[PDB]
């Protein structure tokens, strides 16, 4: 749903109301690009 992977904003638009493709990591330090509720 909203919590899923991305590469830009548009990747998270319409699929759900979560336009904010953010960059965070897990506990390991793997930075990944994921759809968030906000910027």
């Amino acid at each position: 749903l909203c919590n899923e992977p991305c590469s830009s904003n548009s990747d998270c638009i319409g699929i759900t109301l979560c336009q904010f493709c953010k960059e965070k990591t897990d506990q390991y330090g793997l930075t990944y690009r994921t759809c968030n509720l906000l910027p």
Side-chain angles (χ1 to χ4, degrees):
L1 257 193
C2 182
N3 278 73
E4 274 303 74
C6 59
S7 287
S8 280
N9 42 18
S10 52
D11 312 27
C12 309
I13 282 183
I15 61 66
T16 290
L17 317 183
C18 292
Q19 39 173 258
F20 301 105
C21 178
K22 268 292 241 207
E23 185 180 84
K24 70 135 73 235
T25 179
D26 59 14
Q27 51 259 100
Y28 297 144
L30 281 65
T31 294
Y32 42 66
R33 296 102 191 179
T34 50
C35 300
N36 189 48
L37 213 74
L38 292 174

Coordinates of all heavy atoms in Angstrom, one line a residue:
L1 N 0.9 -1.2 0.0 CA 0.0 0.0 0.0 C 0.9 1.2 0.0 O 1.7 1.4 -0.9 CB -1.1 0.0 1.1 CG -2.5 -0.3 0.7 CD1 -3.4 0.0 1.9 CD2 -3.0 0.5 -0.5
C2 N 0.8 2.1 1.0 CA 1.6 3.4 1.1 C 3.1 3.1 1.4 O 3.9 3.6 0.6 CB 0.9 4.2 2.2 SG 1.6 5.8 2.5
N3 N 3.4 2.2 2.3 CA 4.7 1.8 2.6 C 5.2 0.8 1.6 O 4.9 -0.4 1.7 CB 4.8 1.1 4.0 CG 4.9 2.1 5.2 OD1 3.9 2.8 5.5 ND2 6.0 2.1 5.8
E4 N 5.9 1.3 0.5 CA 6.4 0.5 -0.6 C 7.7 1.1 -1.2 O 8.0 2.3 -0.9 CB 5.3 0.2 -1.7 CG 4.4 -1.0 -1.4 CD 5.1 -2.3 -1.3 OE1 5.7 -2.6 -0.2 OE2 4.9 -3.2 -2.2
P5 N 8.4 0.4 -2.1 CA 9.7 1.0 -2.8 C 9.4 1.9 -3.9 O 8.3 1.8 -4.6 CB 10.4 -0.2 -3.2 CG 9.3 -1.3 -3.6 CD 8.3 -1.0 -2.5
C6 N 10.3 2.8 -4.3 CA 10.2 3.8 -5.4 C 11.6 4.3 -5.9 O 12.7 3.8 -5.5 CB 9.4 5.0 -4.8 SG 10.2 5.8 -3.4
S7 N 11.6 5.2 -6.9 CA 12.7 5.8 -7.5 C 12.5 7.4 -7.8 O 13.5 8.1 -7.9 CB 13.0 5.2 -8.9 OG 13.6 3.9 -8.7
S8 N 11.3 7.9 -7.7 CA 10.9 9.3 -7.8 C 9.5 9.4 -7.1 O 8.8 8.5 -6.7 CB 10.9 9.8 -9.2 OG 12.2 10.1 -9.5
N9 N 8.9 10.7 -7.1 CA 7.6 11.0 -6.5 C 6.4 10.3 -7.2 O 5.5 9.8 -6.5 CB 7.4 12.5 -6.5 CG 7.8 13.3 -7.8 OD1 8.0 12.7 -8.8 ND2 8.0 14.6 -7.7
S10 N 6.4 10.3 -8.5 CA 5.4 9.8 -9.4 C 5.0 8.3 -9.3 O 3.9 7.9 -9.5 CB 5.8 10.2 -10.8 OG 7.1 9.7 -11.1
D11 N 6.0 7.6 -8.8 CA 6.0 6.2 -8.5 C 5.1 5.8 -7.3 O 4.8 4.6 -7.1 CB 7.5 5.9 -8.1 CG 8.6 6.4 -9.0 OD1 8.5 7.4 -9.7 OD2 9.7 5.8 -8.9
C12 N 4.7 6.8 -6.5 CA 3.9 6.7 -5.3 C 2.6 7.5 -5.4 O 1.8 7.5 -4.4 CB 4.7 7.2 -4.1 SG 6.4 6.5 -3.9
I13 N 2.3 8.1 -6.5 CA 1.2 8.9 -6.8 C 0.1 8.0 -7.4 O 0.4 7.2 -8.3 CB 1.7 10.0 -7.7 CG1 2.4 11.1 -6.9 CG2 0.5 10.7 -8.5 CD1 2.9 12.3 -7.6
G14 N -1.1 8.2 -7.1 CA -2.3 7.5 -7.7 C -2.4 6.0 -7.2 O -3.5 5.6 -6.9
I15 N -1.3 5.3 -7.1 CA -1.2 3.9 -6.6 C -1.8 3.8 -5.1 O -2.3 2.8 -4.7 CB 0.2 3.3 -6.8 CG1 1.4 4.0 -6.1 CG2 0.5 3.3 -8.3 CD1 1.4 3.9 -4.5
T16 N -1.6 4.9 -4.4 CA -2.1 5.3 -3.1 C -1.8 6.9 -3.0 O -1.1 7.4 -3.8 CB -1.3 4.5 -2.1 OG1 -1.6 3.2 -2.1 CG2 -1.6 5.0 -0.7
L17 N -2.4 7.6 -2.1 CA -2.2 9.0 -1.8 C -0.9 9.3 -1.1 O -0.9 10.1 -0.1 CB -3.5 9.5 -1.1 CG -4.8 9.0 -1.6 CD1 -5.9 9.7 -0.7 CD2 -5.1 9.4 -3.0
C18 N 0.2 8.7 -1.5 CA 1.5 8.8 -0.7 C 2.6 9.3 -1.6 O 3.7 8.7 -1.8 CB 1.8 7.5 -0.1 SG 0.6 7.1 1.3
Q19 N 2.5 10.5 -2.2 CA 3.4 11.1 -3.2 C 4.9 11.3 -2.8 O 5.8 11.6 -3.6 CB 2.9 12.5 -3.7 CG 2.3 13.4 -2.7 CD 2.0 14.8 -3.4 OE1 2.8 15.8 -3.2 NE2 1.0 14.9 -4.2
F20 N 5.2 11.2 -1.5 CA 6.5 11.5 -1.0 C 7.5 10.3 -0.9 O 7.7 9.7 0.1 CB 6.3 12.2 0.4 CG 5.5 13.5 0.2 CD1 4.2 13.6 0.6 CD2 6.2 14.6 -0.4 CE1 3.5 14.8 0.4 CE2 5.5 15.8 -0.6 CZ 4.1 15.9 -0.2
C21 N 8.1 10.0 -2.1 CA 9.2 9.0 -2.2 C 10.4 9.5 -1.4 O 11.2 10.4 -1.9 CB 9.5 8.8 -3.7 SG 10.9 7.6 -4.0
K22 N 10.6 9.0 -0.2 CA 11.7 9.3 0.7 C 12.9 8.4 0.6 O 12.8 7.3 0.1 CB 11.1 9.3 2.2 CG 10.6 10.6 2.7 CD 11.6 11.6 2.9 CE 11.7 12.1 4.3 NZ 12.3 13.5 4.5
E23 N 14.0 8.8 1.2 CA 15.2 8.1 1.4 C 15.6 7.9 2.9 O 15.9 8.8 3.5 CB 16.4 8.7 0.6 CG 17.6 7.8 0.6 CD 18.8 8.4 -0.1 OE1 19.5 9.2 0.4 OE2 19.0 7.9 -1.3
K24 N 15.4 6.6 3.3 CA 15.8 6.2 4.7 C 16.5 4.8 4.6 O 16.7 4.2 3.6 CB 14.5 6.2 5.6 CG 13.5 5.1 5.2 CD 12.9 4.3 6.4 CE 11.9 5.2 7.2 NZ 12.3 5.3 8.7
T25 N 16.8 4.3 5.8 CA 17.4 3.0 5.9 C 16.7 2.2 7.1 O 16.0 2.8 7.9 CB 18.9 3.0 6.0 OG1 19.5 1.7 6.2 CG2 19.4 3.7 7.3
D26 N 17.0 0.9 7.1 CA 16.7 -0.1 8.0 C 17.7 0.0 9.2 O 18.2 1.1 9.5 CB 16.8 -1.4 7.3 CG 18.2 -1.7 6.7 OD1 19.1 -1.0 7.1 OD2 18.3 -2.6 5.8
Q27 N 17.9 -1.1 10.0 CA 18.9 -1.1 11.1 C 20.3 -1.5 10.6 O 21.3 -1.3 11.3 CB 18.4 -2.1 12.1 CG 18.0 -3.5 11.5 CD 16.5 -3.6 11.4 OE1 15.9 -3.5 10.4 NE2 15.8 -3.8 12.5
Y28 N 20.4 -2.0 9.4 CA 21.7 -2.5 8.8 C 22.5 -1.3 8.2 O 23.7 -1.4 8.3 CB 21.3 -3.5 7.6 CG 20.6 -4.7 8.0 CD1 19.6 -5.2 7.1 CD2 20.8 -5.4 9.2 CE1 18.9 -6.4 7.4 CE2 20.1 -6.6 9.5 CZ 19.1 -7.1 8.6 OH 18.4 -8.2 8.9
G29 N 21.8 -0.3 7.7 CA 22.4 0.8 7.0 C 22.2 0.8 5.5 O 22.9 1.5 4.8
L30 N 21.3 0.0 5.0 CA 20.9 -0.1 3.6 C 20.0 1.1 3.3 O 18.8 1.0 3.6 CB 20.2 -1.3 3.2 CG 21.0 -2.6 3.1 CD1 21.6 -2.9 4.4 CD2 20.0 -3.7 2.8
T31 N 20.5 2.1 2.7 CA 19.6 3.2 2.3 C 18.9 2.7 1.1 O 19.4 2.3 0.1 CB 20.4 4.5 2.0 OG1 21.0 5.1 3.2 CG2 19.3 5.5 1.5
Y32 N 17.6 2.9 1.2 CA 16.6 2.5 0.1 C 15.7 3.7 0.0 O 15.5 4.6 0.8 CB 16.0 1.2 0.5 CG 15.6 1.0 2.0 CD1 14.6 1.8 2.5 CD2 16.3 0.1 2.8 CE1 14.1 1.6 3.8 CE2 15.9 -0.1 4.1 CZ 14.7 0.6 4.6 OH 14.3 0.4 5.9
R33 N 15.0 3.8 -1.2 CA 14.0 4.8 -1.6 C 12.6 4.2 -1.5 O 12.3 3.2 -2.1 CB 14.4 5.4 -2.9 CG 15.7 6.1 -2.8 CD 16.8 5.3 -3.4 NE 18.1 5.9 -3.1 CZ 19.3 5.6 -3.4 NH1 19.6 4.5 -4.1 NH2 20.3 6.3 -2.9
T34 N 11.8 4.7 -0.6 CA 10.5 4.2 -0.2 C 9.4 5.3 -0.1 O 9.7 6.4 0.5 CB 10.5 3.6 1.2 OG1 11.2 4.4 2.1 CG2 11.3 2.2 1.1
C35 N 8.2 5.0 -0.6 CA 7.0 5.8 -0.5 C 6.7 6.1 1.0 O 6.4 5.2 1.7 CB 5.9 5.1 -1.2 SG 6.2 4.7 -3.0
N36 N 6.6 7.4 1.4 CA 6.2 7.8 2.7 C 4.9 8.7 2.6 O 4.6 9.3 1.5 CB 7.3 8.7 3.4 CG 7.0 8.9 4.9 OD1 6.6 8.1 5.6 ND2 7.0 10.2 5.3
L37 N 4.2 8.8 3.7 CA 3.1 9.7 3.9 C 3.4 11.2 3.6 O 2.5 12.0 3.2 CB 2.6 9.5 5.3 CG 1.1 9.7 5.4 CD1 0.4 8.4 4.8 CD2 0.9 9.6 6.9
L38 N 4.6 11.6 3.9 CA 5.1 13.0 3.9 C 6.6 13.1 3.4 O 7.3 12.1 3.4 CB 5.0 13.5 5.3 CG 3.6 13.8 5.8 CD1 3.7 14.2 7.2 CD2 3.0 14.8 4.9
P39 N 7.1 14.4 3.1 CA 8.5 14.6 2.8 C 9.4 14.7 4.0 O 9.2 13.9 5.0 CB 8.5 15.9 2.0 CG 7.3 16.7 2.6 CD 6.3 15.6 3.0

